[PDB]
Design a protein around this nucleic acid. Sequence first.
DNA 1: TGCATCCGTGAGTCGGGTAATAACGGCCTGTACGCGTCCGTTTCCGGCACCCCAAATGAACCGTCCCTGGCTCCAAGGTGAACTCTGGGCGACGAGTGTT
Length: 50
Amino acid sequence: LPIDDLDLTVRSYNCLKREGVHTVGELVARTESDLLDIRNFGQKSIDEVK
DNA sequence: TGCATCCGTGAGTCGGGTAATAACGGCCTGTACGCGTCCGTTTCCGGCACCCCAAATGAACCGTCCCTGGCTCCAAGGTGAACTCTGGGCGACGAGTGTT
């Protein structure tokens, strides 16, 4: 499933589509620590992803 | 009346082919073959009596497969504002450190 299908807000889509994350399969493959590593990552994005 | 004297059957199994004599004219014919000629056949040149036969030459011609006309009623391009990062800009604070 793509991350857009999760019907989320501005920042998470922006910071994901620049770097080529297209699905939630790679997102569930990546752990919370491996996804929070990104510079200027929103804590609200962390909350919604968790 | 023996008695020698023939005399009549064996005896199994799956490389070829090796020769003589007096005979000689002359006539007949006979069946097969070789000549010259004539007639039925048959096969075409071009003719009709016409058989007409026909693809090609005028129509419509009407439905239909293309043009032009106007009309929408909407969903995409144009017009807003914010905001959550996104990024840079500002500022203060602290020990490892250039020096005699």
